[PDB]
Design a protein around this ligand. Structure first.
Ligand SMILES: COc1ccc2c(c1)[C@]1(COC(N)=N1)c1cc(-c3cc(Cl)ccc3F)ccc1O2
Length: 373
């Protein structure tokens, strides 16, 4: 899949995008890769923040669905007009499909002033598509109309604002992109990429919470989120324990809340005083789990003296495994088998003493009880 390796770009904190073409003749757009939503929606008007936009009037293969779509979400909104058109991915499989496209005609806090992308590719399932589950998501269209296998994988590698890179392998797995074995956790339900966390440790010390708290009201794998977001009660316990383990140095409460930065003399960041963080995920087998472990190199994010933000934050919408988790791992979205694979990423940032890890098997009882209903 060498043609697809390194097909993602971005700027730090502004997400990962892939090149796509829409319409005939082809119009090239940079599109945000989002496993946390399910619409293919593209800027369709000259918003001043956009480098380019979909000009439906220039496409011979454009079809109007004569229906609007309205998409408020927690940090913004977008609105638009539904249609279909032909779509390809230049650094993806050699195929062209007819996909649903939402031509974005009004928005608020959706486009980023300074980014290089113009649309969003929602890779999640129809159940959370707007306006309803009858709007077939892109990837469903791709799989139905071609012989592209029903799976994709992401290697997110991270870095005035640093450029980031990664790979979206569409229709398979590139084994060069990880070390060790893949370990799979079941997709609990096909809406978000919902998973179940069964145990949490900070430097091997169990938080000892009712595991339902870890997944209240859901836990998801989300390439469209930067932080590791945790339910409020879990965040409180996690920070208490991370404070304790790192107490060699003291920081203000605002650091832990993301309200301020911490800085060290360039090149002297004391990675060693910060603990590793492990999430045990439901495994493939009854009473079997595995654990994924990240380093402070994943959860202390550089802000451009070396200065960092604490990139674990609280959530009222459940655990969100964003870039802080995904940049440690090669992640396989094995839609065909309703499961998500994690393996140590060949590009993850680490040091001489510790590495991001994926380890198993472990015995964990009552894992089904950890899910919220
Ligand atoms: C209905 O759900 C929606 C709808 C729209 C929507 C998003 C979700 C969102 C927010 O979280 C996720 N996963 N995608 C989302 C995320 C981002 C975004 C993602 C990253 Cl990784 C970084 C910066 C961003 F602004 C930009 C736009 C954006 O729009």
């Amino acid at each position: 899949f060498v043609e697809m390796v390194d097909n993602l770009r971005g700027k730090s904190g502004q997400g990962y995008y892939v090149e796509m073409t829409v319409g005939s003749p082809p119009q090239t757009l940079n599109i945000l890769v989002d496993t946390g939503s399910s619409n293919f929606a593209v800027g369709a008007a000259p918003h001043p923040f956009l480098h380019r936009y979909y000009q439906r009037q220039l496409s011979s293969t454009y079809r109007d669905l004569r229906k609007g779509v309205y998409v408020p979400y927690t940090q913004g909104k977008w609105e638009g007009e539904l249609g279909t058109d032909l779509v390809s991915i230049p650094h993806g499989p050699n195929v062209t499909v007819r996909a649903n496209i939402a031509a974005i005609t009004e928005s608020d806090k959706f486009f980023i002033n300074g980014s290089n992308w113009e649309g969003i590719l929602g890779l999640a399932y129809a159940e959370i598509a707007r306006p309803d589950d009858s709007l077939e998501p892109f990837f469903d269209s791709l799989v139905k109309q071609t012989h592209v296998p029903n799976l994709f994988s992401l290697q997110l590698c991270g870095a005035v604002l640093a450029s980031v890179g990664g790979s979206m392998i569409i229709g398979g797995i590139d084994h060069s992109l990880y070390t060790g074995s893949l370990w799979y956790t079941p997709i609990r339900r096909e809406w978000y990429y919902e998973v179940i966390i069964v145990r949490v440790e900070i430097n091997g010390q169990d938080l000892k919470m009712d595991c339902k708290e870890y997944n209240y009201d859901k836990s998801i794998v989300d390439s469209g989120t930067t932080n590791l977001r945790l339910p409020k009660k879990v965040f409180e316990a996690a920070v208490k324990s991370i404070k304790a383990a790192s107490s060699t140095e003291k920081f203000p409460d605002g650091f832990w809340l993301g309200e301020q930065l911490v800085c060290w003399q360039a090149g002297t960041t004391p990675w060693n005083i910060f603990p590793v963080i492990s999430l045990y995920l439901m495994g493939e087998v009854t009473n079997q789990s595995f654990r994924i472990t990240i380093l402070p190199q994943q959860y202390l994010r550089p802000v451009e003296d070396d200065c960092y933000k604490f990139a674990i934050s609280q959530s009222s919408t459940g655990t969100v495994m964003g870039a802080v988790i995904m940049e440690g791992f090669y992640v396989v979205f094995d839609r065909a088998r309703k499961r998500i694979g994690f393996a140590v990423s060949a590009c993850h940032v680490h040091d001489e003493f510790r590495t991001a890890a994926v380890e198993g098997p472990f015995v964990t009882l009552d894992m089904e009880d950890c899910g919220y209903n």
